[PDB]
Amino acid sequence: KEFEVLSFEIDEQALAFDVDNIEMVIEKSDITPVPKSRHFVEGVINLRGRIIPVVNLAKILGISFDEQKMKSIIVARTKDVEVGFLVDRVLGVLRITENQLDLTNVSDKFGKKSKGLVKTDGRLIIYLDIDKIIEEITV
Amino acid sequence: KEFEVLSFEIDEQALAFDVDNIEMVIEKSDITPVPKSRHFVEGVINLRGRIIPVVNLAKILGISFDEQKMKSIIVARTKDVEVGFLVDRVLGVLRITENQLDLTNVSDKFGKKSKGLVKTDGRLIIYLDIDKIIEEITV
Amino acid sequence: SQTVRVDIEKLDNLMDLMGELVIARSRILETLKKYNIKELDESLSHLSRITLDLQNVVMKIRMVPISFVFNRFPRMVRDLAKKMNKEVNFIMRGEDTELDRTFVEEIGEPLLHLLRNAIDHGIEPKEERIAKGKPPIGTLILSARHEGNNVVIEVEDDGRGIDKEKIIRKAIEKGLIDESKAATLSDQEILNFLFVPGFSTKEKVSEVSGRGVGMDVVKNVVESLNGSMGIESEKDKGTKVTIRLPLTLAIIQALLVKVNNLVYAIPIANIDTILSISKEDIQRVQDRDVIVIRGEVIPVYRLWEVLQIEHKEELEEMEAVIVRVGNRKYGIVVDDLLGQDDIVIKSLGKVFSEVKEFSGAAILGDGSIALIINVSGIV
Amino acid sequence: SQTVRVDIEKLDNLMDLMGELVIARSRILETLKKYNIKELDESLSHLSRITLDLQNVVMKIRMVPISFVFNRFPRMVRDLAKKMNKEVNFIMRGEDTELDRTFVEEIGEPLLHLLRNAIDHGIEPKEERIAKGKPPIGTLILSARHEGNNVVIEVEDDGRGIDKEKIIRKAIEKGLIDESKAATLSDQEILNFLFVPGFSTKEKVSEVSGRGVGMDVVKNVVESLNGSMGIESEKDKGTKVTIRLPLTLAIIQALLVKVNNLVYAIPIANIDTILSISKEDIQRVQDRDVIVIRGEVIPVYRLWEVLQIEHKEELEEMEAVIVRVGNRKYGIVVDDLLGQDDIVIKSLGKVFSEVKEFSGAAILGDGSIALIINVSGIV
């Protein structure tokens, strides 16, 4: 299968999840505070007439990050919920080949909510599982 | 019977019809010309969301007028139609009594369209009937 | 399950208030033209979009599916067929096809007559079909659909068909056509004399007063609702009648022109070209003004002359619109060209009944009044 | 004029367009107070006039009479009267009382099980009716009306009444309440045990008439739709049931209050009064504070505390909002009081469902998000 994913970075590390679960992408501006909210969330924004929660991806994966550097909110779309992810730069749509996709889950510490790792001669594009990431926020 | 009528003049001649059959009163501003119009009509205006014809009363009755002096449109109201009547100055609302009302209209041009003649305070106020006046203008 | 019951008059009132929002949209555009602010340009761009989406939904819910009128026919048609002593299959398709409130109410009785005449003349009794070696059960098909930004309603039988030789010869006998014009006219064109009075006898059509619904009436009603109607027939192949009606009266495409700075709308569908002509060219032969265009001779008319209104004295290079009517086309000279739009036709008024040049007034988007020219009203 | 059909999907899209039009009204209003333009006020005011007319037309087609939905229900009561060999008169006064279509659908089979248990339970046979000298045919009544931000459904009978004296004794068997508490209670709180799930689960699998008295099934639905239900009963005076539900979908009349300049809306429907209190009058007897206002003692809560927002500095005269909950009412002390307006609830989604304190955001006229306090969620 030829998978189409959205490529984007955090802290000099490439990441990506499918285009199937994308609403659009925007640049950060003031995020409305919600009182007594979970620590891995920034707040809420109004996007296309809907109230989208703005999650901080790196606090879900447990990876190192620098908060000021981030400025791109990637709005996702699942059947359960629609959620924005604050990150660094974005590339766009990257067609990946099944031949170059490794499925090992013990390679790095966030490998269980990662669907795999795309091998390449540039920065290694890690394939996430949107599903298991939304499954984390609702517990 | 105590009928309350709308009093107004044309070339110093007094006239009046009931308040029961009134929509409003306005000053003539840009009446749209309709090509091939009969001699007694000025044209049409949009009032209260409806397209109202502006007739020139004195050219229906058969009496004198000045068309730069006349500048008041009295908009009427029957079950059938709403039509504006272009005339001179207006006085206002007058309660009339049967005791000062005469039915002699033997010598009048519009005397079979007149309900009577009101002999109030030295004036000769002729009482009109909107219905029979509107039946003449229709084609 | 749930669904809404509402009067048509209430959605007609919701359409009316929608047309007030168009004027208010035009008043915010006036403020935008004076004050030129990107915020308000954006706010008006969103309001323009919402008004366009909203006017589509109101118009859509107001349109009536023709199914109520359609399912009035099968029981009426069967009783007629039985009394007429014949057997037909009725095939009815496109049942919930949507058209205007005015059109669904007007068309029902003329289409009942069209169907009634199709079984009476067209569909043979069984014994006649058995004599022609043909299948004894007739087939009558009524089919409605959307095409061309309009509504199409097809009616056809497998019946006798119409003698085209009888229609053409009767047109000569009643003095309605010349012998060489008759001999050059095509089959599809000859069957239009069916829609001219006196080519059928049924249901009170010779009457001076209180006349019935003839086949002439059916063609005239379709045309009166601004549509078009066609016929084609052949021996033992039955007769086929095609009716094309607009969707609604709220989308009548026009070219708005001005004379004396007064808006006059011109029906786009009829047109043929728009041309700026010179004052040197125009000439008179032995009648009213003509212009030689493509080596052909076109009878040019001055809008302000045919409408009897005071206008400019002096010659200039004038803009003309060539409009088509019947098999011909005349020129209409106008002063300035405003701009096209799909308008809403309203009544001219009951003090103006005698005027033949205008079919209907209309309220434009800026609240301006504009009358709509009748293409066959000027000669 | 004529009744036509509009389906709910078409009305759902029309509702969204009405929502996009209200946003455009607010975005021109933002632009207007930004640039301070006198002429743009007039332009907008006319738009706002037509929009008010359109809004109330759209609300009329959104709402439905209850007896349009409940149309088969008097026939069902006749058939159940016939089955049990009882004479009863059913009175239904619901034709002028309009309710939302999502609310009416969820509460209909609930209400049917209430009436179906009532015809068995409280409606008398003729022998037992005339044994008590009561009018010879039973009286069971459905009716409704409109009150403020709500629509009130009312059910009443002249039947047996409910055995309240036995219900407290049964409640002690089931372990529902204490006996000294049962002696404290007033009659309408005894009947409130018929609105406890699991107090009676008795049903018929033959009839399929609803569990219990057909009332804890209704109460769950009424609470789910954010309403409020009451009951009263007396032996051989019959029973009466009161049901309050929201006037329209999504719209919530509110009082906007602020903590550290953050907008938090307070539901005006639930309220009881607004007062400026001193901190020198706030006292305590148990674990939490109170204030004696109007002679009554009200359990005060600090908005900023239950939401965990830091309080920088303290001023003596505090603004308080008194809100009603259940049969009672608590005080909400606020930092600033902005100003009322009627807002529209927006979900925060699956990640924020857990929080009792707030069940919904809302979009203000400056484009700002503001959350709505849940009155029964705090306490």
Residue numbers in the entry:
A (entry chain F), B (entry chain D): 9 to 147
C (entry chain C), D (entry chain E): 293 to 671
Give the article text:
core-signaling units, involving the chemoreceptor trimer of dimers (TOD), CheA dimer and CheW monomer. Core-signaling unit/complex: 2 TOD, 1 CheA dimer, 4 CheW. (A) TOD: receptor trimer of dimers. cascade that regulates the motile behavior of the cell.
TarCF:CheA:CheW in a ratio of 9:18:18 μM. monolayers containing reconstituted core-signaling complex arrays. 11 Å in X and Y directions and 15.8 Å in Z direction. CheA-P4 kinase domain alone occupies this density region. all-atom models of the chemosensory array substructures and extended lattice. produce models of the CheA2-hexamer and CheA2-trimer array substructures. CheA dimer displayed either an undipped conformation (top) or dipped conformation (bottom). the R297/E397 contact may play a role in stabilizing the 'dipped' state. in the 'dipped' CheA-P4 and Tsr interface (E361/R394). presence of species formed by cross-linking between CheA-P3 and Tsr.
